[PDB]
């Protein structure tokens, strides 16, 4: 359940979301964010115009470091451009990197479907923990692409 932090949802722009579930993007950079447990399943919500859960991946490592060293070490796996990285971290010296593995694309679970699982679902700005029952219903709708 939620205290275990094994099931979470994050939101990504469509080109980055699709890059995670295809395995091209294996690092996700964040500022301050609740940290999941290791081996947590991270469901990928793709924002407008897709507005759907389109896959998931598993968290294999959490890195916390300084902005410039993380770009050097992990920027190529993170898919975004250097300008987009500097924009996002403008105003802090600290960065967090999620290292992901075992990406799995699924048939999109659209917004109305997610609203049956969670009445007031909104795309998380950072990360939202899934309740046991919420994870159950989500798994019940997972199908191959």
Swiss-Prot record:
Its cofactor is Mn(2+); Ni(2+). Keywords: DNA-binding, Endonuclease, Exonuclease, Hydrolase, Nuclease, RNA-binding. Gene3D superfamilies: Hypothetical protein. It is an enzyme of class 3 (hydrolase). It comes from the Bacteria. Residues 11-68 form the ASCH domain. GO terms for molecular function: DNA binding; endonuclease activity; exonuclease activity; RNA binding. The keyword RNA-binding applies. Active in the presence of Mn(2+) or Ni(2+) ions. No activity detected with Zn(2+) or Co(2+). Its EC number is 3.1.-.-. Shows sequence-specific endoribonuclease activity towards single-stranded RNA (ssRNA), with a preference for the bond between pyrimidine and adenine nucleotides. May also have 5'-exonuclease activity. This is ASCH domain-containing ribonuclease.
């Amino acid at each position: 359940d939620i205290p275990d932090r094994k099931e979470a949802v994050i939101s990504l722009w469509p080109e980055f979301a699709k890059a995670i579930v295809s395995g091209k993007k294996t690092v996700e950079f964040r500022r301050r964010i609740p940290l999941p447990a290791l081996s947590a399943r991270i469901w990928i919500f793709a924002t407008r115009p897709v507005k759907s859960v389109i896959g998931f991946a598993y968290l294999e490592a959490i890195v916390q470091g300084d902005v410039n060293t993380l770009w050097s070490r992990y920027g190529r796996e993170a898919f975004l451009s250097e300008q987009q990285y500097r924009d996002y971290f403008e105003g802090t010296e600290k960065a967090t990197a999620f290292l992901l593995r075992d990406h799995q694309p699924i048939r999109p679970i659209n917004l109305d479907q997610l609203k049956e699982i969670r009445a007031n679902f909104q795309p998380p700005q950072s990360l939202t923990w899934l309740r046991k029952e919420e994870t159950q219903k989500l798994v019940s709708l997972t199908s191959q692409v």
